[PDB]
């Protein structure tokens, strides 16, 4: 299942070292995790909570925060951000 990220998601992935325009979903998830981790967007106490309100991630998800445990929600964000 190869995917092609829209401009905003692509900007996010490239910001963490991704140098391609076509991805497998696992690669997309890998680099999104790298982005969240490197920018420390997760809550330090309940580390499945991710705050994205004042970050490009917030524009992608269209929400202020989400839980890493909500897999369907995360997949839905990627899918809506694909061409």
């Amino acid at each position: 299942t190869l995917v092609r990220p829209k401009p905003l998601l692509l900007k996010l992935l490239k910001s963490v070292g991704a140098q391609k325009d076509t991805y497998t979903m696992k690669e997309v998830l890998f680099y999104l995790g790298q982005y969240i981790m490197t920018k420390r967007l997760y809550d330090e106490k309940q580390q499945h909570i991710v705050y994205c309100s004042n970050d490009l991630l917030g524009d992608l998800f269209g929400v202020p925060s989400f839980s890493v445990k909500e897999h369907r929600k995360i997949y839905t964000m990627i899918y809506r951000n694909l061409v």
Partner: peptide
């Protein structure tokens, strides 16, 4: 659990 722990599950 740590952020990496939760996230790694999405790669499982």
């Amino acid at each position: 659990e740590t952020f990496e722990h939760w996230w790694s599950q999405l790669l499982s």
